[PDB]
């Protein structure tokens, strides 16, 4: 039925948008890179882009290369290109070049939709100056904040374009005498948003064009935060089908293992894994092993990432998680 891996997605040809996210230091970035590398290696034809909003420049840290606002290609790859931009340190540079400001914090979701299209822009620009079309883009969703909440903006902006009017047509003599000192602009320029962000929406709501992958560690506070997230995404009508449970130490059988503490934690993780499996039967629950020390740079990110395709087997693969010391 539903295989315990992301093979079906790394093999998929239909998808164009993939989102990876997860609060807490669970492995979002590492997974982001892994899903990227894996997809790139499995489809040579297509061209890929791994983009990150984070200010701390994580992708750069992960690979050990300096990626900037300029979509460079991963040194050692051939269709994977990373791009790190800051939409906040660009929003304070968009308009910083009044009314178009005092209505954003008023309406929940704008700032996001704005910041996002600011990104999409920086992307198509690259595809121009480089004349190279990206078939699929992977989003290293930002750690904090509901980065892609704008998907509700439409149904929310409708309550205003049906209000700013239901008051302009319920008080007629004073809707006419109501010389709107401000032209239809507000009710017309923030009317085109419910479109310029309604097309992008029927992109991210197509079960075959975009999907989200949740990263989580197997402890309570995390299985919670992600159950929350899965709900937040279900509401947006986005597709959530796979969760990658990271940092599992399959201690039940280990090489050079004879430590007491470590085996106590595994016992707990195991407990919750069984619960996750029970809670999400229709989901792709991917178990990833906890390697000894950092997983940095392509040579390792790759080696580690293959366990998103062919599920990791603690017995046989036990060694491969030690080539990373």
């Amino acid at each position: 039925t539903v295989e315990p891996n992301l093979h079906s997605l790394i093999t998929s040809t239909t998808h164009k948008w993939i989102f990876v996210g997860g609060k807490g230091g669970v492995g979002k970035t590492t997974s982001s890179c892994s899903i990227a590398i894996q997809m790139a290696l499995s489809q040579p034809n297509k061209q890929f882009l791994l983009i990150s909003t984070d200010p701390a420049h994580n992708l750069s840290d992960a690979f050990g290369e300096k990626f900037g606002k300029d979509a460079r290609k991963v040194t050692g790859m051939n269709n994977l290109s990373c791009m790190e931009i800051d939409p906040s340190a660009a929003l304070k540079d968009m308009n910083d070049m009044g009314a178009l400001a005092d209505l954003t914090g008023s309406i929940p979701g704008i700032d996001e939709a704005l910041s996002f299209m600011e990104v999409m822009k920086h992307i198509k620009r690259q595809e121009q100056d480089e004349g190279e079309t990206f078939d699929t883009v992977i989003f290293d969703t930002a750690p904090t904040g509901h980065t892609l909440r704008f998907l509700q903006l439409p149904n929310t902006l409708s309550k205003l374009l049906e209000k700013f009017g239901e008051i302009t047509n319920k008080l007629g003599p004073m809707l006419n005498s109501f010389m709107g000192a401000g032209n239809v602009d507000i009710s017309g320029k923030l009317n085109e948003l419910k479109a310029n962000v309604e097309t992008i929406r029927q992109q991210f709501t197509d079960p075959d064009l975009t999907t989200f992958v949740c990263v989580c560690i197997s402890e309570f506070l995390s299985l919670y935060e992600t159950e929350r997230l899965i709900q937040e995404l279900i509401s947006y009508d986005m597709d959530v089908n796979s969760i990658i449970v990271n940092q599992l130490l399959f201690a039940e059988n280990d090489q050079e293992h004879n430590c007491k503490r470590c085996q106590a934690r595994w016992k707990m993780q195991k407990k919750y894994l069984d619960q996750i499996d029970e809670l999400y039967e229709d989901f792709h629950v991917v178990k990833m092993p906890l390697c000894a020390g950092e997983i940095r740079g392509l040579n390792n990110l790759t080696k580690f990432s293959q366990f998103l395709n062919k599920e990791y087997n603690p017995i046989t693969d036990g060694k491969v998680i030690y080539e990373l010391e």
């Binding site: 159950e227 709900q231 407990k271 919750y272 619960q275 029970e278």
Partner: protein, 62 residues
């Protein structure tokens, strides 16, 4: 006849209150499974009881 806004606003608010008391009897840790299920449920009843609050209110408005 005070049916829909009575027999409903009660059956629910009552069942919810019957579940909420059942949820606080299992380990959200040992039964994360069920626990989270029940919560999801209580999250719906919380909305369809906040709907019958407007269905019963907009009735004194229409």
């Amino acid at each position: 006849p005070g049916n829909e806004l009575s027999k409903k606003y009660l059956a629910k608010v009552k069942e919810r209150h019957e579940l909420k008391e059942f949820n606080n009897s299992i380990s959200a840790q040992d039964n994360y499974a069920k626990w989270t299920k029940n919560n999801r449920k209580l999250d719906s009843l919380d909305k369809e009881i906040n709907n019958l609050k407007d269905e019963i209110q907009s009735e004194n408005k229409a």
